[PDB]
């Protein structure tokens, strides 16, 4: 779960612009009803897909266990047909709930 601390000068639209989301989505995920933002308030950010650059010694199993997902979900997300991975390969990572 990604969050963000509201800084002086921030607004729901100014933050939404940065992280490529909408004002409504920010309010919908935080349960807000007002456009007011207190400096220091913690806002929940819309989930963005994590990423991993395959390093020496990595396996799909180790990466899956590391990022709280499964080998199966990892391969599906990246359209893989075999478990082999190469050093330097960029993998899209499922969410920690196998999502």
Residue numbers in the entry: 16 to 114
Sentences from the paper on this structure:
LysM domains, which are frequently present as repetitive entities in both bacterial and plant proteins, are known to interact with carbohydrates containing N-acetylglucosamine (GlcNAc) moieties, such as chitin and peptidoglycan. Here, a structural study of the Thermus thermophilus NlpC/P60 endopeptidase containing two LysM domains is presented. Glycosidases, such as muraminidases and glucosaminidases, hydrolyze glycosidic bonds between carbo­hydrate units, while peptidases, such as amidases, l,d-endopeptidases, d,l-endopeptidases, l,d-carboxypeptidases and d,d-carboxypeptidases, hydrolyze amide bonds of the peptide stem at specific positions. d,l-Endopeptidases belonging to the papain-like peptidase superfamily possess an NlpC/P60 domain which is responsible for their catalytic activity. This domain is commonly associated with PGN-binding domains such as the SH3b domain, choline-binding domain or lysin motif (LysM).
We have also successfully solved the crystal structure of P60_2LysM without any ligand. By comparing the LysM domains in this structure with the LysM domains in the full-length P60_tth and the P60_2LysM–chitohexaose structures, we observe that binding of the carbohydrate triggers only minor structural rearrangements in the binding pocket. Only the side chains of Gln53 and Arg32 reorient upon carbohydrate binding (not shown). However, the relative positions of the two LysM domains differ significantly in the bound state compared with the unbound states. The linker seems to allow some flexibility between LysM domains, but we cannot claim for certain that the movement is triggered by carbohydrate binding because such movements may arise owing to crystal packing. Our structural data reinforce this observation and clearly indicate that the two LysM domains in P60_tth are flexible despite being separated by a short linker of only four amino acids.
